[PDB]
Write a protein that binds this ligand. Structure first.
Ligand SMILES: *[C@@H]1O[C@H](CO)[C@@H](O[C@@H]2O[C@H](CO)[C@@H](O[C@@H]3O[C@H](CO[C@H]4O[C@H](CO[C@H]5O[C@H](CO)[C@@H](O)[C@H](O)[C@@H]5O[C@H]5O[C@H](CO)[C@@H](O)[C@H](O)[C@@H]5O)[C@@H](O)[C@H](O[C@H]5O[C@H](CO)[C@@H](O)[C@H](O)[C@@H]5O)[C@@H]4O)[C@@H](O)[C@H](O[C@H]4O[C@H](CO)[C@@H](O)[C@H](O)[C@@H]4O)[C@@H]3O)[C@H](O)[C@H]2NC(C)=O)[C@H](O)[C@H]1NC(C)=O
Ligand SMILES: *[C@@H]1O[C@H](CO)[C@@H](O[C@@H]2O[C@H](CO)[C@@H](O[C@@H]3O[C@H](CO[C@H]4O[C@H](CO)[C@@H](O)[C@H](O)[C@@H]4O)[C@@H](O)[C@H](O[C@H]4O[C@H](CO)[C@@H](O)[C@H](O)[C@@H]4O)[C@@H]3O)[C@H](O)[C@H]2NC(C)=O)[C@H](O)[C@H]1NC(C)=O
Ligand SMILES: *[C@@H]1O[C@H](CO)[C@@H](O[C@@H]2O[C@H](CO)[C@@H](O[C@@H]3O[C@H](CO)[C@@H](O)[C@H](O)[C@@H]3O)[C@H](O)[C@H]2NC(C)=O)[C@H](O)[C@H]1NC(C)=O
Ligand SMILES: *[C@@H]1O[C@H](CO)[C@@H](O[C@@H]2O[C@H](CO)[C@@H](O[C@@H]3O[C@H](CO)[C@@H](O)[C@H](O)[C@@H]3O)[C@H](O)[C@H]2NC(C)=O)[C@H](O)[C@H]1NC(C)=O
Ligand SMILES: *[C@@H]1O[C@H](CO)[C@@H](O[C@@H]2O[C@H](CO)[C@@H](O[C@@H]3O[C@H](CO)[C@@H](O)[C@H](O)[C@@H]3O)[C@H](O)[C@H]2NC(C)=O)[C@H](O)[C@H]1NC(C)=O
Ligand SMILES: *[C@@H]1O[C@H](CO)[C@@H](O[C@@H]2O[C@H](CO)[C@@H](O[C@@H]3O[C@H](CO)[C@@H](O)[C@H](O)[C@@H]3O)[C@H](O)[C@H]2NC(C)=O)[C@H](O)[C@H]1NC(C)=O
Ligand SMILES: *[C@@H]1O[C@H](CO)[C@@H](O[C@@H]2O[C@H](CO)[C@@H](O[C@@H]3O[C@H](CO)[C@@H](O)[C@H](O)[C@@H]3O)[C@H](O)[C@H]2NC(C)=O)[C@H](O)[C@H]1NC(C)=O
Ligand SMILES: *[C@@H]1O[C@H](CO)[C@@H](O[C@@H]2O[C@H](CO)[C@@H](O)[C@H](O)[C@H]2NC(C)=O)[C@H](O)[C@H]1NC(C)=O
Ligand SMILES: *[C@@H]1O[C@H](CO)[C@@H](O[C@@H]2O[C@H](CO)[C@@H](O)[C@H](O)[C@H]2NC(C)=O)[C@H](O)[C@H]1NC(C)=O
Ligand SMILES: *[C@@H]1O[C@H](CO)[C@@H](O)[C@H](O)[C@H]1NC(C)=O
Ligand SMILES: *[C@@H]1O[C@H](CO)[C@@H](O)[C@H](O)[C@H]1NC(C)=O
Ligand SMILES: *[C@@H]1O[C@H](CO)[C@@H](O)[C@H](O)[C@H]1NC(C)=O
Ligand SMILES: *[C@@H]1O[C@H](CO)[C@@H](O)[C@H](O)[C@H]1NC(C)=O
Ligand SMILES: *[C@@H]1O[C@H](CO)[C@@H](O)[C@H](O)[C@H]1NC(C)=O
Ligand SMILES: *[C@@H]1O[C@H](CO)[C@@H](O)[C@H](O)[C@H]1NC(C)=O
Ligand SMILES: *[C@@H]1O[C@H](CO)[C@@H](O)[C@H](O)[C@H]1NC(C)=O
Ligand SMILES: *[C@@H]1O[C@H](CO)[C@@H](O)[C@H](O)[C@H]1NC(C)=O
Ligand SMILES: *[C@@H]1O[C@H](CO)[C@@H](O)[C@H](O)[C@H]1NC(C)=O
Ligand SMILES: *[C@@H]1O[C@H](CO)[C@@H](O)[C@H](O)[C@H]1NC(C)=O
Ligand SMILES: *[C@@H]1O[C@H](CO)[C@@H](O)[C@H](O)[C@H]1NC(C)=O
Ligand SMILES: *[C@@H]1O[C@H](CO)[C@@H](O)[C@H](O)[C@H]1NC(C)=O
Ligand SMILES: *[C@@H]1O[C@H](CO)[C@@H](O)[C@H](O)[C@H]1NC(C)=O
Lengths: 176, 222, 906
């Protein structure tokens, strides 16, 4: 009921114009039968798939209370807010794609705590800050894209960032 | 054929014919049985036999009716409700009180508790009368060459309007939209209400070897 | 006393009249009934013996939705003229021969009272009534009379009370004729056509002066103040005015103020008063009754109270319900003589405070259906309250401790509020009959002290709170409850002990309690006239085959979700809801046949009933839903199941049936047909598509169904769940799948299933919602979807040896939210158009024999959550998309020629 409570907290804070969140109800023992939520064995949430679903709102601090989550997809939605620091508690996240969306703030350093992340797409967003230093400490990150964002500071290349291209960091106020 | 249960019915296409002995226990040594005879398109024909005696001789004992299933539409979206009903009746001995009535039930939503009820009394025998807060009519309405007196009353949380004819009408043919429009314009019935149910049938109080035959009954909602 | 000729005349009068209800039973010629004066309705002079009063009138006794009056039918005999000293005659509610008013009444010569009102007289008033010179009270109201000339009223010069309402009034100059009666004090002219008959000012100018006190002008389509203005000529002497049901659309005329001696105003049932009380009031100083119900005033309540401040010491009844009035009820105590205050169904969004300490004389207070906030006032300031309705408001806080100072309360309705607690002094009321405190957030425990002295309580309603009810052992309840609605109340770990003394109750709903005890020995016989039994969602254990005894008035039995064990209990002959699921019953259910029943919804699921299903279902033809799932029944399905014409939901799954399936042809209005498991054999029934046309869910999975899916199944037009997985089918998938409407709508929620329990609120029925489950193969897990009708839209034909190609007609199926066509010998290519399926969250085409390359349109999904195309003979490159690249290598493996970013590279 803890994961269902977290997902319900996510639901209440956001507003749905197309009404694609109507099937999320707390009475069920698990949120497994909910739409746009993918299950696994033993009924733990492992995917949250919401693409061009027109959702508007802000992110929820207790979103990270899901331990066995992977592939958190929330791109192309009208979500205005700040990336929570609790996302670092995800010990199994793989793909975090939040692009074509309007989130303001910096990229948390705790996000670099992900030791199994492979995909990170934050494009066409307006985030004010600099690239985290600790994010390069993960060696499983195969692709990254931080473009068309309010990015300033230095461009890190050492370590896992040595296999990337400047295109991943483009259209920014300061790149040097 | 002919069935005698308290809640049994003979369902057909677009019509459901009930027995509805909802106040059976208020009478002593009575019985009632209804049956659908012939079906022809939208036309129906049924009959009801009963005998009720004693007990609370001032209360309705049953409402064996012939209800119609339709799309739950708001009053303002209803164009016409053409209805025709021809019936004959036969009682035997005496101390006879009964009634032939149309019921319309309307509520705020398409599936909810009734908030407005509409009686149309086509015949009143033995002093049976509609429910009224004051016991006196509040309007006189002539619709389709047929006089009517209007009564208003409470029933729990429901408001019951009643159009009682001045002469017994054994052959009726009219439009219920006229009554509904009169109620909406004059008596203050909201036009956004959802017409839940339409039905027509007998409503006995006391009788002995009693039988009502509906030679024809048709209705529709447009 | 009792002159012989008078008695003979009375007997001859009775002879014509036909009495059927015991009236005139005292009247007779038997020697024991010789005395005239002792008869019912006859009064005689004391000195002489002549009859002075003859009142054979009745009254309307009313029931649920009909009133009845014991009318006297017959012919009015002319022998009444022998009663030459009669002065009081009253024949009011009787309906005699519905004909003219008899003319002989003109020659009584001493009548001082006549009342033929509410009979069924018709036609013109006889012209001979000019001989009734001694008449003081005339009442001919509410008959089918036609009054077109009033030239006879001139002679009746002793009248003080004239009533001609309900007539076809066509007198053009009625004011001129009425003004000729010098002693008239009231005048009833209701329901006439007074809208079209207004007196010209010249007529008022040329008229004799008379002083009226009561005007009954109702049911006249005035619709304006320009048509009832004439009554203001009587402003000096008016006391009572009645103007209800006139379609008044405008401000109340300011001349209603400055009507001195006015004591009774009735302006109910208008069109729109547009503001309500004018500022002209406050000059009244003598008001005692004001009614404005159902008028759409839109007035501020404190402003109304200030404008009625001229008559605080006299005002007694104030009806302001069914309007739209806002504000708060502040200082109601300043109205000293107030006794009724009806403020129902308003828009009152304020508080209820006294803020000054005086006692109130209120006896009936009504505040239901509002938006009032804040705590309740000190109820000890209303010691004479007989009824208190405060439901559907937003009151909060504990009920005040002074509630026990009333000692006259009979009804207490505080339901649907945000109340917080119950006081201890509630038990000293000693006159309460109903207690509706349901759907509040109530907390604490109700001990015996809360119920110590309620000797007249009949209804107890504490539904759905956080409340607890712990009564000590050796407590004898001082009441005998008739309805016991205590759901979601902690009634103790053991079975409640105070039900031992409770007989004579009609409903008993103690579900959602915490009773974890065996069924007690004493709890063997329910009251003989019990209606609703609901012991559901507890942990009660024992044998209940000895608890149901075919009471004539059973309507609901709900023993679901418990620890009951034993044989199937008796099915009462008039029960409609028979729920027994999630228990431990075992045995055969052949006892569901021997008696005809009115059951419409029975649930026997999740039990241990065994044996072959009986062939007796013609004795139960009122069924709407039938649940025989998750048991170990066996054998063929009975043929009698085809006689369930009213059936709309058949839940027969997770059993061990066998054989072919019976002809459920004449079972129209069937929406759900679930037959999972059950080892059924045979070809797919050809009558499913031919006859069943309202079907929405068709679950024939984990069976032995050889053959082919005939295209007739496309004629269903309403299917949203099709599931034939693991059935051993064959043939090609039909190309006719376009015809399934509701699978093209992008976002459409189907209505839930609803059956009808008739007779709940007396004449009125109740609608029950059955949200049945459905076992589906959802996202690689076998899951029990809760309400499949509203949301789910799936097609599943996996593991059924289907040979052919995927039809190209599935492209435009926007609403499909799952697709499983795996483990079949299909060949071809993925149809170009799957990318058009916007809300498809589950795709599975694995273990087929497909070919070609993946279509590019799959990049448009953006909602797909589970994909599996393994072992399918594809080639080419996987389309690039955010969702496609987020899938494991296992989802695309098994293809010897496919290569993409997920696996290897070209
Ligand atoms: C010629 O003969 C004819 C005979 O046909 C005479 O006509 C008869 O005259 C008698 C008078 O002797 C009449 O009897 C009297 O009736 C009145 C009215 O009773 C009805 O109304 C009461 C109040 O109703 C309002 O309030 C209630 C809630 O309190 C509400 O439910 C109602 O709907 C109504 O509400 C309206 O008003 C509210 C306040 O403003 C508004 O808020 C609201 O929105 C509405 O606008 C009501 O209490 C009463 O209830 C009784 O009846 C029902 C149904 O049968 C029953 O269920 C109840 O249990 C009650 O029994 C009625 O509905 C009544 O007030 C009189 O009471 C006197 O007698 C009793 C006897 O015990 C005393 O205790 C009283 O103190 C009081 O003295 C009396 O009964 C009769 O109705 C009338 N009949 C006809 C057909 O006209 C005629 O008078 C004769 N001619 C002459 C010249 O005399
Ligand atoms: C035997 O007794 C049992 C238990 O006492 C009965 O089962 C209960 O029946 C009641 C009445 O139908 C159920 O109450 C209803 O629950 C609905 C579902 O609630 C969930 O969903 C809503 C909406 O998403 C949430 O807000 C809520 O928190 C829950 O998560 C409600 O939607 C209903 O509300 C409607 O009615 C109330 C009261 O009239 C209104 O105030 C509302 O505005 C709304 O209109 C309602 O509360 C209850 O859930 C059942 N419990 C169980 C365990 O099943 C049996 O019905 C009874 N037997 C028979 C034959 O009646
Ligand atoms: C790749 O390069 C980045 C910088 O370009 C490295 O980040 C830096 O890592 C060093 C550790 O080698 C950090 O130094 C530490 O700083 C903390 C205070 O923040 C101090 O307490 C420690 O004693 C230590 O000095 C440094 O802060 C950090 N950031 C910056 C801006 O220099 C990153 O570690 C490199 N990754 C590798 C080499 O794998
Ligand atoms: C029952 O019958 C008796 C007798 O007929 C009635 O008594 C009569 O009442 C009237 C009215 O009061 C009396 O008339 C008055 O008489 C006095 C004295 O004679 C006279 O001064 C007055 O001018 C007026 O005429 C009449 O005398 C009296 N009868 C007798 C014999 O004294 C009585 O009223 C009847 N009861 C009812 C209820 O009608
Ligand atoms: C369907 O319901 C009907 C009626 O509810 C059942 O018929 C009833 O069957 C019982 C058992 O055989 C009969 O009771 C016996 O009647 C005989 C003859 O009167 C009597 O000698 C026995 O001592 C015993 O009382 C009962 O009379 C009979 N009622 C009617 C109206 O026929 C029927 O068995 C149920 N099942 C099927 C499949 O029809
Ligand atoms: C698509 O679904 C519709 C139903 O919505 C199917 O239309 C149905 O077609 C049958 C053909 O056998 C019609 O039955 C016929 O009825 C007439 C009049 O009762 C009768 O004289 C014929 O002998 C025959 O029984 C049925 O009425 C009709 N239903 C509707 C609502 O039109 C259609 O066949 C399905 N398949 C397609 C369009 O490919
Ligand atoms: C579509 O329906 C088919 C069956 O009609 C579903 O196939 C099921 O797939 C799961 C996962 O591949 C199988 O679980 C397997 O269990 C064995 C142990 O028994 C394990 O060794 C495997 O690794 C795998 O986890 C399951 O047996 C299989 N059902 C069968 C064969 O009857 C399929 O999941 C459905 N597709 C979707 C998207 O729901
Ligand atoms: C209530 O009655 C008083 C009289 O008792 C009304 O006052 C009259 O009108 C004006 C007031 O501005 C003055 O000429 C006198 O006070 C009164 N005139 C007379 C007696 O001829 C007062 O207007 C009434 N209330 C309302 C709201 O009209
Ligand atoms: C229950 O109510 C009855 C009312 O009839 C109480 O009887 C009397 O109550 C008064 C005060 O309310 C006492 O002064 C009397 O002594 C009571 N009479 C008797 C014989 O005791 C009764 O006391 C109430 N119950 C309890 C437990 O107090
Ligand atoms: C929802 O999203 C679609 C894009 O598929 C867009 O066309 C539509 O305008 C959106 N609705 C609202 C209310 O913004
Ligand atoms: C919602 O999202 C659409 C998609 O691009 C965007 O055009 C629109 O401006 C957004 N609405 C807002 C931010 O209010
Ligand atoms: C979750 O993240 C927050 C934010 O940094 C952190 O304080 C908390 O300790 C984390 N939870 C656990 C169990 O470590
Ligand atoms: C980001 O915005 C630019 C224009 O500001 C647009 O050309 C580009 O297509 C956007 N990114 C995506 C992924 O659509
Ligand atoms: C009515 O009064 C007149 C005047 O005395 C009288 O001549 C006539 O006979 C009376 N009518 C009847 C029917 O008595
Ligand atoms: C006006 O009043 C006088 C008073 O006697 C009366 O004679 C005359 O008939 C009245 N006018 C009319 C038109 O009736
Ligand atoms: C009656 O009222 C009208 C209107 O106010 C007035 O003109 C007329 O003088 C009044 N007549 C009497 C006799 O009071
Ligand atoms: C039993 O209940 C009935 C209502 O059905 C009631 O009239 C009667 O007074 C009650 N008797 C007792 C002793 O409680
Ligand atoms: C009552 O039962 C509920 C669940 O049925 C449980 O959570 C609660 O602790 C129980 N309370 C007591 C006092 O037994
Ligand atoms: C009632 O049944 C449930 C599950 O069937 C079980 O866990 C529980 O122990 C049972 N109650 C008792 C008192 O054993
Ligand atoms: C039903 O009967 C079979 C065979 O006797 C048994 O295996 C099964 O356990 C029974 N069902 C239940 C729920 O015990
Ligand atoms: C698919 O299988 C059928 C069954 O043998 C075969 O006739 C057909 O030719 C196959 N499809 C193709 C494209 O060869
Ligand atoms: C659907 O896919 C086609 C082919 O790739 C593409 O041209 C089209 O833009 C897509 N639809 C949307 C709404 O992007």
């Amino acid at each position: 009921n803890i994961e269902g409570d977290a997902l319900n907290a996510l639901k209440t804070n956001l507003a749905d114009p197309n009404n694609v969140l109507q099937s999320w109800d707390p009475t069920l023992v698990n949120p497994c039968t909910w739409f746009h939520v993918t299950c696994n064995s033993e009924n733990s949430v492992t995917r949250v798939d919401l693409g061009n679903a027109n959702l508007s709102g802000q992110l929820v601090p207790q979103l990270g209370q899901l331990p066995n989550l992977q592939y958190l997809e929330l791109y192309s939605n009208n979500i205005s807010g700040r990336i929570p620091f609790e996302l670092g508690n995800l010990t199994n996240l793989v793909s975090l794609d939040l692009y074509l969306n309007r989130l303001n703030g910096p990229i948390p350093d705790t996000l670099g705590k992900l030791q199994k992340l492979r995909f990170l797409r934050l494009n066409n967003n307006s985030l004010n800050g600099r690239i985290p230093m600790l994010l390069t400490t993960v060696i499983s990150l195969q692709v990254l894209d931080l473009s068309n964002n309010n990015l300033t500071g230095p461009v890190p290349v050492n370590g896992s960032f040595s296999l990337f291209t400047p295109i991943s960091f483009a259209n920014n106020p300061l790149d040097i | 054929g002919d069935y005698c249960g308290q809640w049994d019915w003979a369902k057909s296409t677009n019509y459901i014919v009930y027995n509805n002995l909802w106040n059976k226990n208020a009478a002593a040594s009575g019985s009632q049985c209804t049956g659908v005879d012939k079906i022809s398109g939208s036309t129906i024909a049924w009959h009801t036999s009963y005998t009720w005696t004693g007990g609370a001789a001032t209360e309705v004992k049953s409402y064996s009716n012939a209800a119609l299933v339709f799309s739950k539409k708001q009053i303002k979206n209803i164009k016409s409700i053409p209805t025709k009903m021809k019936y004959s009746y036969s009682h035997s001995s005496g101390t006879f009180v009964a009634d032939v009535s149309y019921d319309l039930f309307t509520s705020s939503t398409a599936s909810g508790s009734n908030e407005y009820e509409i009686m149309i009394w086509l015949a009143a025998y033995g002093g049976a009368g509609p429910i009224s807060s004051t016991g006196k009519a509040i309007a006189t309405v002539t619709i389709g060459s047929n006089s009517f007196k209007l009564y208003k009353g409470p029933n729990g949380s429901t408001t019951v309007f009643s159009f009682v004819a001045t002469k017994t009408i054994t052959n009726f043919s009219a439009d219920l939209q006229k009554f509904l429009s009169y109620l909406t314009k004059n008596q203050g019935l909201p036009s956004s209400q959802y017409l839940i149910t339409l039905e027509a049938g007998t409503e006995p109080f006391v009788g002995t070897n009693a039988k009502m035959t509906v030679s024809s009954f048709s209705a529709a909602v447009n | 006393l009792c002159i012989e000729k008078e008695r003979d005349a009375l007997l001859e009068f009775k002879r014509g009249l036909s009495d059927n209800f015991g009236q005139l039973s005292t009247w007779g010629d038997e020697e024991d009934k010789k005395e005239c004066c002792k008869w019912k309705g006859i009064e005689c002079n004391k000195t002489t013996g002549h009859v002075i009063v003859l009142d054979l009138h009745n009254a309307f006794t009313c029931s649920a939705s009909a009133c009845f009056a014991p009318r006297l039918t017959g012919k009015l005999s002319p022998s009444l003229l022998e009663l030459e000293y009669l002065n009081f005659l009253d024949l009011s509610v009787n309906e005699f021969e519905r004909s003219e008013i008899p003319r002989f009444i003109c020659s009584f010569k001493r009548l001082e009272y006549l009342n033929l009102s509410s009979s069924f007289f018709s036609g013109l008033i006889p012209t001979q009534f000019k001989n009734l010179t001694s008449l003081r009270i005339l009442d001919l109201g509410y008959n089918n009379l036609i009054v077109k000339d009033l030239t006879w009223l001139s002679h009746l010069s002793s009248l003080e009370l004239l009533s001609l309402g309900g007539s076809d009034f066509q007198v053009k100059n009625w004011f001129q004729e009425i003004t000729k009666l010098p002693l008239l004090k009231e005048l009833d002219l209701s329901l006439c056509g007074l809208s079209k008959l207004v007196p010209s000012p010249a007529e008022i100018a040329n008229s004799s002066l008379i002083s009226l006190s009561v005007l009954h002008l109702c049911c006249n389509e005035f619709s304006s103040s320009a048509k009832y203005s004439w009554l203001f000529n009587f402003s000096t002497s008016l006391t009572s005015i009645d103007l209800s049901n006139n379609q008044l659309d405008g401000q109340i005329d300011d001349r209603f103020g400055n009507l001195m001696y006015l004591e009774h105003l009735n302006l109910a049932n208008e069109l729109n008063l547009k503001g309500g009380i004018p500022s002209s009031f406050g000059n009244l100083t003598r008001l005692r009754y004001l009614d404005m119900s159902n008028t759409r005033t839109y007035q501020w309540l404190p402003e109304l109270f200030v404008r009625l401040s001229g008559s605080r010491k006299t005002l007694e009844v104030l009806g302001l319900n069914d309007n739209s009035m806002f504000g708060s009820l502040v200082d109601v105590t300043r109205f000293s003589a107030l006794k009724r205050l009806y403020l129902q169904k308003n828009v009152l969004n304020g508080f209820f405070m006294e803020r000054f300490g005086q006692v109130s004389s209120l006896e009936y207070l009504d505040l239901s259906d509002n938006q009032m906030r804040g705590p309740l006032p000190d109820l000890a300031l209303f010691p004479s309250l007989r009824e208190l309705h405060l439901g559907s408001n937003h009151f909060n806080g504990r009920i005040p401790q002074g509630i026990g100072k009333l000692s006259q309360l009979k009804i207490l309705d505080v339901s649907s509020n945000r109340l917080e607690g119950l006081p201890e002094s509630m038990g000293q009321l000693s006159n309460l009959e109903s207690f509706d405190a349901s759907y509040n957030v109530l907390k604490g425990t109700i001990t015996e002290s809360h119920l110590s002295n309620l000797s007249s309580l009949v209804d107890l309603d504490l539904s759905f709170n956080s409340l607890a009810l712990k009564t000590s052992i050796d407590w004898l309840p001082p009441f005998q409850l008739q309805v016991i609605n205590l759901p979601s109340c902690n009634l103790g770990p053991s079975f409640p002990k105070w039900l031992q003394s409770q007989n004579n109750y009609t409903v008993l709903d103690i579900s959602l309690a915490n009773i974890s005890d065996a069924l007690p020995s004493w709890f063997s016989g329910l009251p003989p006239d019990i209606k609703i039994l609901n012991l559901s969602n507890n942990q009660i254990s024992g044998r209940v085959s000895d608890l149901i005894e075919n009471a004539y008035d059973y309507m609901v039995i709900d023993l679901s979700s418990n620890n009951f064990s034993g044989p199937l209990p008796l099915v009462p002959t008039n029960v409609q809801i028979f729920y027994l699921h999630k228990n431990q019953f075992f045995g055969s259910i052949s006892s569901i046949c021997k008696s005809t029943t009115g059951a419409t919804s029975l649930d026997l699921s999740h039990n241990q009933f065994s044996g072959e299903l009986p062939d007796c279902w013609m004795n139960a033809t009122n069924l709407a839903v039938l649940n025989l799932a998750y048991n170990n029944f066996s054998g063929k399905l009975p043929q009698s199941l085809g006689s369930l014409t009213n059936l709309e939901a058949l839940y027969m799954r997770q059993n061990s049936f066998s054989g072919m399936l019976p002809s459920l042809s004449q079972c129209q209005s069937l929406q759900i047909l679930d037959l999972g498991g059950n080892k059924l054999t045979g070809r797919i029934p050809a009558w499913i598509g031919t006859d069943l046309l309202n079907l929405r869910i068709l679950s024939l999975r984990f069976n032995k169904f050889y053959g082919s899916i005939s295209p007739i199944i496309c004629q269903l037009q309403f299917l949203q769940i099709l599931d034939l997985s693991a059935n051993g089918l064959a043939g090609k998938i039909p190309q006719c799948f376009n015809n399934f409407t509701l699978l093209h709508q992008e976002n459409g929620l189907g209505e839930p299933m609803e059956f009808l329990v008739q007779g709940f609120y007396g004449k009125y029925p109740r609608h029950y919602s059955y949200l049945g489950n459905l076992l589906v193969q959802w996202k690689n897990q076998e899951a029990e979807y809760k309400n499949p009708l509203t949301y789910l839209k799936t097609i599943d034909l996996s593991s059924n040896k289907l040979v052919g190609g995927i039809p190209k007609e599935m492209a435009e199926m926007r609403g499909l939210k799952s697709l499983n066509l795996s483990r079949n010998d299909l060949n071809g290519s993925i149809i170009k158009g799957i990318g058009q399926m916007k809300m498809l969250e589950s795709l599975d085409l694995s273990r087929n024999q497909l070919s070609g390359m993946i279509p590019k349109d799959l990049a448009n999904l953006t909602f797909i959550g589970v994909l599996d195309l393994s072992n399918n003979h594809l080639s080419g490159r996987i389309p690039s998309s955010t969702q496609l690249q987020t899938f494991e290598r296992s989802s695309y493996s098994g293809n010897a020629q496919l290569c993409g970013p997920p696996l290897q590279e070209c």
